[PDB]
Design a protein around this ligand. Structure first.
Ligand SMILES: Nc1ncnc2c1ncn2[C@@H]1O[C@H](COP(=O)(O)OP(=O)(O)O)[C@@H](O)[C@H]1O
Ligand SMILES: [Mg+2]
Length: 703
């Protein structure tokens, strides 16, 4: 029956392997099950072999890759679950539902760990902001993101937005979620023999073979209460491949099989066929396995939240996924056959054009810095995302609260404790397109730097990989270099992966999106020893860890002045990066500084301007090197911070004992940003910096 086989999308080679795993040919239904379970989305066929390289060990790791999300210990009995997913292709066809659905799904993965969602972060990539479609997609996904999150009660505390040429055809929408729980309640996707499997949530319809957040809230409370009462031994959310992936996965990890009675499955539409029920991806659906003797309890938990919770399947000793419908066995495939699909290895080769661009020498450039800073602040990639986060609410919850003082990483305070959880997601497409490996390294480094900058220690990360097809040598190369990049940054900084995602085939017409590894990092700190980026008072000494000179390759200023992106991305010394991150955390924990900000895209001056916005406090400094490289050039491992006058020596003593280059630029205060250079004084009023920075994205989004 190879006919229908290759007619649905299953490769001859793959089909032949399926007949040898079943010792027979699958019927129509079984064939449809494999088509979906063996697709790259579910099987990760081309990425698994490479992902084995990512370091997983870490002091704070409680749960790494394998479960619906990664979990790390944060102290005083608390733990944090988190993960990042993608909903690219669907957001492309319909931005509103795509984004909202991306949020619903990520939320369920975090809930299944028994962790109550405390925050959402979005990682977005669209084409240039002047193009109609780019504006459309941006309006769509943020509208959709706001809709689900605001309705379910989980705030979107931050994220990463970037506009770029390489995303014109394939936009990216990744959602990261943070959830907290008591370690004692850490649950996974396990089931013991002889247990019934419950189904709760919306009824199964003919969906993706729109999300309801209102029902999501109910679903979330019940699941969380159910686990908080220790009534379950396993919980699984239903997403891609619906019931099929939920149960087979659950069964496979449990070392046994599951018998599904489709007739007991709640239906929303009439005349639904077996495959339709099995492959529906209807939203807000949940699988739960009550512990022995707690079935009733589980039902009551859902009864309390006005939800139905009914038995739909049971575990069996035979490691198989047996599907029953109207009295007949319509499918019975071995669990292993469904969960362990073939993987592929290829030979990557870099796209010669990528090399050509990277090796292009950066030409001598000249421009009026008075205007370059204003032009950079007005760039849609550097301007305020204020109009975006204004769509979201619920910064204050029932256990956690977002600290309103703008820090480089979102900081969620755990009420009743001194604990604070910091989070950030990063990646630079320009660096990544020109040097995927260095781009990936920069992403993890930056994310960790941002958390370190508010005073928290990086505990682990989550990586949402987004690339073109792995078929072509150039594409596989980008995937390979991206993964090698993370490994290298991870090993050097001592920060392990705990979860993640992989989205491939993000390309059309031979045009590949810039390799995109959206790195999410979680860390913890004492809310009382926190730092934010805004200058808070006049008279503080302003210092810089690292050097003033940045590079122009793949930089913002280069793009602004040439309209192009080329050259080598900034070099990254992982040893320096680690030492700087520890230096800044020490500085903050010892109470020497409570205001820090790292120097990233746009260079020293842009970083400087961003610090005057939060409180309207200016700064006066001296930069010893003139030239674009010093004022706007980019370089990692650079951090700005302020100390109280009589504490300068202790801070400088600390940096010196760490062998770290540093400089005392000047002080804070006034209603201007003033910069002395060997060629004179450059000056801007905080007003002009502010208006230039505030307008760009606000009109694009609300105009
Ligand atoms: N790039 C990656 N890095 C680390 N872990 C990953 C990566 N991609 C996938 N994983 C892990 O492999 C598993 C598969 O993800 P997935 O099946 O898509 O979960 P779901 O479908 O419910 O969103 C998860 O445990 C996930 O955390
Ligand atoms: Mg930053």
């Amino acid at each position: 029956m190879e006919a229908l086989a290759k007619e649905i999308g299953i490769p001859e080679g793959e089909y032949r392997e399926i007949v040898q795993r079943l010792g027979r040919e699958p019927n129509r239904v079984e064939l449809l099950l494999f088509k979906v379970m063996w697709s790259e989305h579910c099987a990760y066929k081309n990425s698994r072999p490479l992902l084995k390289a990512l370091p997983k060990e870490g002091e704070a790791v409680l749960q790494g890759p394998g479960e619906n999300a990664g979990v790390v210990r944060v102290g005083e009995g608390w733990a944090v679950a988190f993960k990042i997913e993608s909903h690219n292709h669907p957001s492309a066809v319909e931005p509103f539902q795509g984004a909202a659905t991306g949020v619903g799904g990520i939320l369920r993965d975090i809930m299944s760990m028994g962790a109550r969602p405390i925050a959402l972060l979005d990682s977005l990539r669209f084409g240039p902001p002047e193009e109609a479609r780019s504006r459309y997609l941006l309006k769509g996904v943020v509208s959709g993101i706001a809709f689900y999150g605001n309705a379910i009660g989980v705030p979107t505390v931050g994220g990463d937005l970037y506009f770029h040429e390489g995303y014109r055809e394939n936009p990216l929408v990744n959602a990261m979620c943070l959830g907290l729980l008591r370690e004692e309640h850490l649950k996974r996707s396990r089931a013991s023999l002889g247990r019934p499997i419950y189904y709760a949530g919306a009824k199964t319809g003919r969906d993706g073979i729109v999300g309801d957040p209102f029902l999501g809230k109910l679903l979330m409370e019940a699941t969380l209460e159910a686990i908080e009462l220790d009534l379950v031994e396993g919980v699984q959310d239903m997403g891609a491949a619906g019931l099929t992936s939920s149960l087979s996965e659950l069964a496979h990890k449990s070392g046994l099989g599951v018998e599904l009675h489709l007739d007991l499955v709640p239906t929303r539409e009439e005349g639904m066929t077996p495959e339709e029920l099995l492959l529906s991806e209807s939203q807000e659906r949940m699988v739960l396995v009550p512990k022995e003797g707690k079935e009733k309890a589980l039902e009551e938990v859902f009864g309390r939240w006005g939800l139905d919770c009914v038995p739909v399947a049971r575990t069996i000793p035979e490691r198989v996924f047996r599907v029953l419908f109207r009295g007949e066995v319509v499918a019975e495939v071995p669990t292993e056959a469904l969960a362990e699909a073939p993987t592929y290895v290829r030979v990557g080769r870099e796209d010669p054009e990528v090399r050509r661009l990277r090796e292009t020498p950066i030409p001598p450039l000249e421009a009026d810095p008075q205007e370059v800073l204003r032009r950079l602040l007005a760039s849609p990639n550097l301007a305020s995302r204020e109009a975006v986060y204004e769509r979201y609410d619920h910064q204050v919850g029932t256990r956690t609260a977002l600290l309103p003082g703008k820090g480089d990483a979102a900081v969620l305070w755990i009420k009743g404790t001194r604990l604070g959880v910091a989070a950030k997601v990063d990646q630079n497409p320009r660096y990544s397109r020109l040097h995927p490996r260095l781009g990936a390294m920069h992403a993890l480094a930056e994310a960790c730097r941002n958390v370190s900058v508010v005073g928290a220690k990086p505990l682990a990360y989550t990586d949402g990989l987004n690339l073109g097809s792995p078929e072509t040598p150039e594409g596989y190369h980008e995937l390979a270099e991206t993964i090698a990049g993370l490994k290298e940054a991870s090993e050097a900084l001592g920060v392990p992966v705990v979860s993640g995602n992989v989205s491939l085939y993000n390309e059309s017409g031979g045009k590949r999106i810039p390799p995109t590894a959206m790195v999410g990092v979680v860390g913890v700190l004492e809310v009382d020893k926190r730092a934010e980026m805004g200058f808070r008072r006049p008279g503080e000494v302003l210092l810089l860890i690292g050097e003033e000179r940045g590079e122009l390759g793949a930089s913002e200023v280069l793009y602004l002045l040439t309209g192009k992106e080329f050259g080598h991305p900034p070099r990254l010394d992982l040893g320096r990066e680690k030492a700087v991150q520890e230096a800044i955390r020490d500085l903050i924990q010892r109470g020497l500084t409570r205001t820090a900000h790292d120097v990233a895209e746009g260079g020293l001056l842009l970083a400087l301007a961003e610090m005057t916005f939060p409180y309207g406090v200016g700064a006066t400094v001296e930069v010893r090197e003139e030239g674009l490289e010093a004022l706007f050039g980019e370089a990692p491992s650079r951090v700005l911070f302020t100390v109280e006058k009589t504490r300068l020596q202790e801070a400088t003593l600390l940096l010196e004992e760490r062998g770290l280059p540093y400089r005392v630029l000047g002080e804070t205060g006034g209603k201007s940003l003033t910069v002395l250079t060997p060629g004179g004084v450059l000056e801007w009023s905080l007003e002009e910096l502010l208006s230039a920075w505030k307008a760009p994205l606000r009109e694009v989004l609300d105009g």
